[PDB]
Amino acid sequence: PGTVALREIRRYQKSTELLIRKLPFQRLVREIAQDFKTDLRFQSAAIGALQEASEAYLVGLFEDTNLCAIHAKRVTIMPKDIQLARRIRGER
């Protein structure tokens, strides 16, 4: 336990391709946009940029969470590590 996970880490760090599925993400974005103005249109590049920014943000957040979890002498990331990371970043 812990070898295929490292192999997958290595694999996914060698690559750049987006990890969240494109159409579920489109539907999520439309659902969220449905509150601020009814029946909006979106460019495809807008959704692509949103996905790139979201994945970059989440990867940075997982980096900080991993740092905190290692600090606690652990290897498992827990929600309180996320909360501490978002607190120190200054996130609300």
Partner: protein
């Protein structure tokens, strides 16, 4: 659209964690992350839409997203700028 947050599947969050270097992941993370992502997108989209509505347009363009990100110090290269 109703409750499409579950389109961020558990293997997707696991892949994002592996790219982030996480070896072992608690089961409450996935929901935590989902909420975080929601709050992020709601903050970015509210600004992008604000730009789109101010240009008196009806389509959200890539430059609207770029300006919304730039306002938060999230400058993005590759999609214009």
């Amino acid at each position: 659209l109703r409750d499409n947050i579950q389109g961020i599947t558990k293997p997707a969050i696991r892949r994002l964690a592996r790219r982030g270097g996480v070896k072992r992941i608690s089961g409450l993370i996935y929901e935590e992350t989902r909420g975080v992502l929601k709050v992020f997108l709601e903050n970015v989209i509210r600004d992008a839409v604000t730009y789109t509505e101010h240009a008196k347009r009806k389509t959200v363009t890539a430059m609207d997203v770029v300006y919304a990100l730039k306002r938060q110090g999230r400058t993005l290269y590759g999609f214009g700028g």
